[PDB]
Design a protein around this ligand. Structure first.
Ligand SMILES: [Mg+2]
Ligand SMILES: [Mg+2]
Ligand SMILES: [Mg+2]
Ligand SMILES: [Mg+2]
Lengths: 89, 90
C-alpha cells in the first residue's frame, strides 16, 4: 500500500465521529468527540486488476520489445506491443 | 502501478513464445522464429483500490486518542480497527 497526507476538513471530522461512536459500543468509558487534528493519514489498499509483462525478446536474430497483458481473474493473455529492433538493455 | 522483476526460465520463455506467436498472426515483420527472453523481465501490476485505512489523531473528552478506520472502496463500509490512548500530541 501507498500512503498520503489528507487535510482535516469535514470529511476527516466525520471519520473521527465514527471512531468515537464505535469505540463507545466497546466501553475507556463513554467518550465525547472533540476534533481531528493533523496529521491525518490515508492508506490505499491496492489489489490487482491485472498484470503486464514487458519483455526483451530475441526473435530471428533481432531484439524486440514485447508487452503482454494478463487478466487477474481469468488470467487471459493478450499481446499489447511488439516493436523493434531495440538496443540491448 | 507496482513493478517487479521476475527471473527467466520456462515461464518467461512461454511468455516470449506467446509474444512471437501472436505477432506472427499479424505478419508485418514476416514469420518470426522465437529464440529467447532475456533479462530484465518486468511484471507490472495494474492496481485498483480495494479500500482505504485512515489514521487519525482525534480528541475525545479532552483526551487525545489514536484511531484506525478501514473503509471499503466500493461500498465505503467503515470499521473501527484500533483505538488506543491517550497518546502524546505529534
Ligand atoms: Mg520465467
Ligand atoms: Mg521459471
Ligand atoms: Mg508462430
Ligand atoms: Mg483540545
Amino acid at each position: 500500500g501507498e500512503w498520503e497526507i489528507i487535510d482535516i476538513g469535514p470529511f476527516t471530522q466525520n471519520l473521527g465521529k465514527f471512531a468515537v461512536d464505535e469505540e463507545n459500543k466497546i466501553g475507556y468509558g463513554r467518550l465525547t468527540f472533540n476534533k481531528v487534528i493533523r496529521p491525518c493519514m490515508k492508506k490505499t489498499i491496492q489489489v490487482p486488476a491485472g498484470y503486464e509483462y514487458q519483455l526483451y525478446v530475441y526473435a530471428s536474430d533481432k531484439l524486440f520489445r514485447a508487452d503482454i497483458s494478463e487478466d487477474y481473474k481469468t488470467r487471459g493473455r493478450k499481446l499489447l506491443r511488439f516493436n523493434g529492433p531495440v538496443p540491448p538493455p
